Design a protein around this motif. Structure first.
Motif, PDB file in Angstrom:
ATOM      1  N   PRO A  12     -16.697 -21.872  55.698  1.00 12.24           N
ATOM      2  CA  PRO A  12     -17.428 -22.986  56.336  1.00 12.24           C
ATOM      3  C   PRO A  12     -16.636 -23.648  57.463  1.00 12.24           C
ATOM      4  N   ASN A  13     -15.442 -24.198  57.173  1.00 15.61           N
ATOM      5  CA  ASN A  13     -14.549 -24.760  58.219  1.00 15.61           C
ATOM      6  C   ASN A  13     -13.240 -23.989  58.532  1.00 15.61           C
ATOM      7  N   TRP A  14     -13.265 -22.674  58.367  1.00 11.55           N
ATOM      8  CA  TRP A  14     -12.098 -21.818  58.652  1.00 11.55           C
ATOM      9  C   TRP A  14     -11.333 -22.207  59.936  1.00 11.55           C
ATOM     10  N   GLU A  15     -12.032 -22.399  61.057  1.00 14.11           N
ATOM     11  CA  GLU A  15     -11.363 -22.705  62.327  1.00 14.11           C
ATOM     12  C   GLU A  15     -10.463 -23.934  62.190  1.00 14.11           C
ATOM     13  N   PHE A  16     -11.025 -24.996  61.628  1.00 16.20           N
ATOM     14  CA  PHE A  16     -10.237 -26.181  61.342  1.00 16.20           C
ATOM     15  C   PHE A  16      -9.092 -25.851  60.393  1.00 16.20           C
ATOM     16  N   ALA A  17      -9.399 -25.104  59.344  1.00 20.96           N
ATOM     17  CA  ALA A  17      -8.376 -24.702  58.367  1.00 20.96           C
ATOM     18  C   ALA A  17      -7.245 -23.922  59.014  1.00 20.96           C
ATOM     19  N   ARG A  18      -7.618 -23.034  59.918  1.00 20.05           N
ATOM     20  CA  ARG A  18      -6.661 -22.174  60.588  1.00 20.05           C
ATOM     21  C   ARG A  18      -5.764 -22.985  61.491  1.00 20.05           C
TER      22      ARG A  18
END
Ligand SMILES: Nc1ncnc2c1ncn2[C@@H]1O[C@H](COP(=O)(O)OP(=O)(O)O)[C@@H](O)[C@H]1O
Ligand code: BEF
Ligand SMILES: [Mg+2]
Length: 341
Positions: A1-7
């Motif tokens: 869902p929020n991978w980009e933020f997580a990354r």
């Protein structure tokens, strides 16, 4: 869902939990290094009672204490954090900065590689102080050279029969000018073999650190000579063997990044720096070329396209309150550069 933020967060967290062993470790490629260096507030800035709004509380973290007003005129800080491979504070000497920025890349040219090191930032932030040093010997050009000579006279490298050459030039309004040859305007060419040649660029043999410092001092005086950050300066160190190029270290004092005024040389400067960003990212992403080209990136093209190519960026920071919007602009350029890896 929020991978980009997580990354982005992972990347942040990873870049904090890192020692000096990661960049300086061979046995693992570290193709892109990005650093930040805060200079101290100077006498004139203190004389205007400028607030220092930067802190470097760890070897990886830089804080900007952005001064702000609430809607109702209440003052407050937005304390913004930025992490880098290294973060030098207002005490760090040029020697310390050199040790973790360019010094590791020296070896790369001896292993047949191409290296590049860039001083990037607003006008007055320390680009030239870092690279150039009136006193050339206190700079990275000089220090890189010092160490290039030591590597030459080591057992590992004596067999290669290497001769050391130097170049020194200024890129201004998309024209190249040889600083070791009285600002001679040179002509840049794309060979039908897709590769770039600077026609008339004087290489000069050097045998000795002090030779090199002699040359730097001359080129520096030739730059000024009249009356910078109007233009890019690039000083190269070439290792050749049988006239055949072994490796090459190009060390660049970039132009002032501050351009949103509207003397629209500032357009040229902008396209350069955007292009540089794309070339640096192209590096780690063997990937075709800067995309809206610039000379800077033409001339330096060979030092990114290579398989055995390293680079290091040093963002320069003016700590004053009045520089805060520039500082934040420097830092965000740097963010995106490091973003690859
Ligand atoms: N790290 C530093 N420590 C002390 N003085 C510095 C430092 N960095 C820059 N300066 C000062 O800033 C000026 C150097 O020009 P510089 O700021 O390096 O050019 P640029 O505008 O290309 O960054 C000099 O007055 C120099 O003494
Ligand atoms: F910002 Be400069 F004169 F390399
Ligand atoms: Mg300058």
């Amino acid at each position: 869902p929020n991978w980009e933020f997580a990354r982005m967060i992972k990347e942040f967290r990873v870049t904090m939990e890192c020692s000096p062993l990661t960049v300086t470790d061979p046995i693992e490629e570290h193709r892109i290094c990005v650093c930040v260096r805060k200079r101290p507030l100077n006498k004139q800035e203190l004389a205007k009672k400028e607030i220092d709004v930067i802190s470097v509380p760890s070897k990886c973290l830089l804080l900007v204490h952005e001064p702000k007003l609430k809607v109702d005129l209440t003052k407050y800080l937005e304390n913004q954090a930025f992490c880098f491979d290294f973060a030098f504070d207002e005490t760090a000497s040029n020697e310390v900065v050199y040790r973790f920025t360019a010094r590791p890349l020296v070896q790369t040219i001896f292993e047949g590689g191409k290296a590049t090191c860039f001083a990037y930032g607003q006008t007055g932030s320390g680009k030239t102080h870092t690279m150039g040093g009136q006193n050339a010997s206190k700079g990275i050009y000089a220090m890189a050279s010092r160490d290039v000579f030591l590597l030459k006279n080591q057992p590992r490298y004596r067999n290669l029969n290497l001769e050391v050459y130097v170049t020194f030039f200024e890129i201004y309004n998309g024209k190249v000018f040889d600083l070791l040859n009285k600002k001679a305007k040179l002509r840049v060419l794309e060979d039908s073999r897709q590769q770039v040649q600077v026609v008339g660029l004087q290489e000069y043999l050097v045998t000795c650190a002090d030779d090199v410092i002699k040359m730097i001092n001359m080129g520096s005086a030739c730059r000024t000579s009249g009356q910078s950050s109007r233009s890019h300066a690039c000083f190269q160190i070439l290792l050749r063997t049988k006239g055949r190029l072994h490796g090459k270290f190009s060390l660049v004092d970039l132009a002032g990044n501050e351009r949103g005024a509207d003397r629209m040389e500032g357009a040229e400067i902008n396209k350069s720096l955007l292009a540089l960003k794309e070339c640096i990212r192209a590096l780690g992403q063997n990937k075709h070329t800067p995309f809206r080209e610039s000379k800077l990136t033409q001339v330096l093209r060979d030092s990114f396209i290579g398989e055995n190519s390293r680079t290091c960026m040093i963002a320069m920071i003016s700590p004053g309150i009045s520089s805060c919007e520039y500082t934040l602009n420097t830092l965000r350029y740097a963010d995106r550069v490091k973003e690859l890896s």
